[PDB]
Amino acid sequence: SSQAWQPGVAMPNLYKMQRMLLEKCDLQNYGDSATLPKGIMMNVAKYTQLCQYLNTLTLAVPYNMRVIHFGAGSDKGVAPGTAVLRQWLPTGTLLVDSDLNDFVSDADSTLIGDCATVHTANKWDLIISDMYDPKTKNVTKENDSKEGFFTYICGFIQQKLALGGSVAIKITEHSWNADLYKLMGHFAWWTAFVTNVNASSSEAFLIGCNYLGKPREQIDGYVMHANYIFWRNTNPIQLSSYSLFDMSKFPLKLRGTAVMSLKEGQINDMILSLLSKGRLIIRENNRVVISSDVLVN
Amino acid sequence: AFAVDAAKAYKDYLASGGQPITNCVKMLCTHTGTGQAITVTPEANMDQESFGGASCCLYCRCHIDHPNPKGFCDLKGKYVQIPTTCANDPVGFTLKNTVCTVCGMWKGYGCSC
Numbered sequence A: 001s002s003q004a005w006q007p008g009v010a011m012p013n014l015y016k017m018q019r020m021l022l023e024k025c026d027l028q029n030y031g032d033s034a035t036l037p038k039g040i041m042m043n044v045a046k047y048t049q050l051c052q053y054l055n056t057l058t059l060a061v062p063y064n065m066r067v068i069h070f071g072a073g074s075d076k077g078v079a080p081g082t083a084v085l086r087q088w089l090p091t092g093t094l095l096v097d098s099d100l101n102d103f104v105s106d107a108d109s110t111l112i113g114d115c116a117t118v119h120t121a122n123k124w125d126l127i128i129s130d131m132y133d134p135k136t137k138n139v140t141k142e143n144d145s146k147e148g149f150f151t152y153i154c155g156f157i158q159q160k161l162a163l164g165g166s167v168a169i170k171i172t173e174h175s176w177n178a179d180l181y182k183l184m185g186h187f188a189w190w191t192a193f194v195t196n197v198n199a200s201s202s203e204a205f206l207i208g209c210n211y212l213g214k215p216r217e218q219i220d221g222y223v224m225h226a227n228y229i230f231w232r233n234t235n236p237i238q239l240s241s242y243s244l245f246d247m248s249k250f251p252l253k254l255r256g257t258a259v260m261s262l263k264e265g266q267i268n269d270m271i272l273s274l275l276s277k278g279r280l281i282i283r284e285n286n287r288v289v290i291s292s293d294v295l296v297n
Numbered sequence B: 001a002f003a004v005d006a007a008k009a010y011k012d013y014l015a016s017g018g019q020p021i022t023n024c025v026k027m028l029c030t031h032t033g034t035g036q037a038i039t040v041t042p043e044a045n046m047d048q049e050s051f052g053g054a055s056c057c058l059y060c061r062c063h064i065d066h067p068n069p070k071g072f073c074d075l076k077g078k079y080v081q082i083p084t085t086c087a088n089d090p091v092g093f094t095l096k097n098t099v100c101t102v103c104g105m106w107k108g109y110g111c112s113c
């Protein structure tokens, strides 16, 4: 297993192309825990390896980059993931995070409440979601597509994600959405990434890369999640904290990616090509305005 | 004329044998950094640990107002460097100690001025 020195393992293309039936996910390493560096949280290690992997992809990194982080608060009351993001992202990058429960964050702005209440005027370059429903841990049924915050995320991506932008959305065996998988086909490239520290878990980050605003690929969500489960079942991943010990190359390289404002009729194959290569961002350059809806009763 | 003082409250708590505030967010870094007290990215040297600023702030963690007219926080949004020996209580360290203005280091720790 040479994968131990990588930040994690990404779902191989051949597994994406299959057609499989959804099975129960039984992991060989289930219950095992990676050995973390002294005094390091799981969430810090997990987010570190996620960013370390994102450095290997082609991401548009414009000046005044806009990143939004959903489900950033922990049960401890802090925001470990946000901290890693801020470290990783270029200095001056506007970072907004949100969670259902109150928490303390290093982000530029923090919204407390259900994600469905969150509204933003502008668009975003990068979207990160660690959101997980604890009620998913209770299985009273088969494993089917999940609504809730997954419904909001798909809407937020289609509406509020700038072209060329990227997303990382946390999923598990029982926490997943079919439309989110179908939405991955609206990106130039996509994968399911599993961190080496959390490898004992069915958890992965669905990663859209360079959003094209339209499907370049048709993806069945139910089939693809079955493919993901099949990959995890037949490919045990060795728990590794190894990549955490080299932080030298960690920060996200600032590419000064161009930001243009185009109508949807102005987007040609030439523009779509620039997007796919991570060399272009299409959105408004205006000021960032966010709000959280408050129900009165 | 009444104001709740947490600074004194936490200091006296520690002296009572109280368990220091935990779950401060420690960052993975090279530990090759400049070693300055408060910075935009983790600057920790070999002798330091780098933490998320907000998690080390007593006023942030206790959900109370900051001791100043503006209510500004010099921790949140930044990263603070705690000496490895004092790293067991990052909140207490930042509270008790002071940052040198000219060289940006901690007063008494790493400050040669």
Ligand SMILES: NC[C@@H](CC[C@H](N)C(=O)O)C[C@H]1O[C@@H](n2cnc3c(N)ncnc32)[C@H](O)[C@@H]1O
Binding pocket: A043, A070, A071, A072, A073, A074, A075, A079, A080, A081, A082, A098, A099, A100, A101, A113, A114, A115, A116, A130, A131, A132, A133, A134, A148, A149
């Ligand atoms: N342990 C994981 C945990 C924290 C992430 C990790 N600790 C981290 O560092 O980012 C996931 C977060 O998802 C939130 N969440 C779940 N459902 C919703 C929802 N519908 N709307 C908003 N937030 C939600 C929930 O409040 C929880 O704090």
Ligand SMILES: [Zn+2]
Binding pocket: B054, B057, B058, B059, B060, B066, B073, B074, B075, B076
């Ligand atoms: Zn503070």
Ligand SMILES: [Zn+2]
Binding pocket: B100, B101, B102, B103, B104, B105, B111, B112, B113
């Ligand atoms: Zn000095």
